[PDB]
Amino acid sequence: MQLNPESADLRALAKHLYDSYIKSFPLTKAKARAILTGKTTDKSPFVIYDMNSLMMGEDKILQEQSKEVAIRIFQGCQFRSVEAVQEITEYAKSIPGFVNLDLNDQVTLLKYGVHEIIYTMLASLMNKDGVLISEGQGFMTREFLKSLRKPFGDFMEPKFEFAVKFNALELDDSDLAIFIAVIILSGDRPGLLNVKPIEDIQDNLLQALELQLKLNHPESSQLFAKLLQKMTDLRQIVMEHVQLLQVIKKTETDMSLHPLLQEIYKDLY
Amino acid sequence: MQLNPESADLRALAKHLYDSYIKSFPLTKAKARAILTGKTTDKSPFVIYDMNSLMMGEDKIPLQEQSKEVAIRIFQGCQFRSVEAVQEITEYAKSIPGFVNLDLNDQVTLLKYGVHEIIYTMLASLMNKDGVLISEGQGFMTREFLKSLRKPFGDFMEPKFEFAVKFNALELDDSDLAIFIAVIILSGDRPGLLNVKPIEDIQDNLLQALELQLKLNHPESSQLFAKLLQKMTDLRQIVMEHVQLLQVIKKTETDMSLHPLLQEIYKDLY
């Protein structure tokens, strides 16, 4: 490793991705950690730890029902998911060379990868106790999400399980900006014609990420390998999610989905 | 990259894994590629490209519907080998430095989730754009023939062929495969394990060994380490779509049994 024009360019590529990551995503890992440790005073979130804390929290964010509780939560998860797909698309277009690829392959790269990004970025909002909700305005506890009516008391546990392992790597927004870009640009997704120009964009991004982690994480040896193996855990989560979603469409027929999400989930896994 | 005691040890770890890989697996990539390119002069396999080539081929290896009878036998022969393969992988796993000293419940666990990932990584060595070597180089079944089989069997081999194409383009050899296989086995993030600390401790070395092997052996391929690691993603997807498909053949066909060794592996998996 040395200071040469190629290394200087890999840093330039890294800065670019970071600046566009900041421009695309409003709730950054730095921003969310600050809240999660109480370093901010403006963003003091309400904690939803039970039913009585949820009903009071709905005032900020029939006679009696617990079914309406699991329905309302799940709908709000897909409410944010749609807003998130918009940001990821805005971001994807800023990756050097993405636009100049086949548009039918741009559609493809975003179709399979959007969910992997969603969950990578969701871990930034999480801790062993719970998740930040409503752009940092609320905090829903892990155990509360777990107590929800079957089979909803299981749709968030794999994300929390992942989040714990991922967060132990101690990555920052500068590292996440390259990693997110790496995930998008993959030459092993189905329905791709031009894998050659994609694998060349990713080769640069991987070269950029390897250097970023070398400079930023002197302590973590084999982090590059560790971070790359998390893409395996992300695919499993995306797969177990669509597998769980088929149970919602079947067992509880009266549970609709947004047409933007309906197109993504169609003919996926 | 430098020559120091740690690097010398990583090479020793690499040699060890290769020598046990050779001892465990009889049909190596080198061996299979020679058959596939007609460089061997004895192992001349019979090509099964349709129905008539299969019947004549069955002479070399039920009044029911022909298309159903043929799909059933093929699918059974895929699992007959799969069993023989699990035995080889287990023999290999025991040779990885530190595997035996771990928890035996964790040893059972690691092999439970990883055996299928290895099976498919090693299956790609027997494959080319045209088909797959069957019965240890005695036969060659075509991709398109496997694709024509009665629903939903005409779909169980396509993901393996798709993978194989991408994996083989990396141009790995038995030395590289020997470390990669070992890396897959020592996966930390699997269910039913509490001793993640010693498991990760083994994989960190294996990964360090693989990074050096690819650096020395593949001077041309600059991000081969990153590329090869991303294939573990494709392997998990295949193992997942496989168990998901296996569910269909039991619900569709009541008269479709499985070997008790495989029955234990697939149980409570994905």
Numbering used by the authors:
A (entry chain B): 230 to 290, 298 to 505
B (entry chain A): 230 to 290, 297 to 505
Quote from the publication.
PPARγ (peroxisome proliferator-activated receptor gamma) is a transcription factor of the nuclear receptor family that functions predominantly as a heterodimer with RXRα. PPARγ is a key regulator of glucose homeostasis and adipogenesis. The recruitment of coactivators by PPARγ is primarily determined by the interaction of coactivator LXXLL motifs with the receptor LBD. Helix 12 is key regulatory structural element in the activation function 2 interacting with coregulators.
The PPARγ T475M LBD mutant was crystallized in its apo form and in complex with GW1929 and the PGC1α coactivator peptide. In both functional states, PPARγ T475M crystallized as a homodimer. PPARγ T475M, localized at the dimer interface, exhibits an increase by 2-fold of the binding affinity to RXRα compared to PPARγ WT, as a consequence of a slower dissociation rate of the dimer. Interestingly, the most frequent mutation, T475M, induced a slightly higher increase in the ligand-independent transcriptional function of PPARγ as compare to any of the recurrent mutations considered. Comparison of PPARγ T475M/PGC1α to PPARγ WT/PGC1α RFUs revealed that different regions of the T475M mutant presented a significant lower deuterium uptake, including H2, H2′, N-terminal H3, H6, N-terminal H8, helix H10, and the H12 helix. These regions are thus more protected from deuterium exchange for PPARγ T475M compared to PPARγ WT, which might be in favor of a decreased conformational flexibility of PPARγ T475M compared to PPARγ WT, in agreement with MD simulation data. Thus, our structural analysis of PPARγ T475M indicates that the mutation stabilizes PPARγ helix 12 in the active conformation as well as the heterodimer with RXRα, leading to a stronger binding to coactivators.
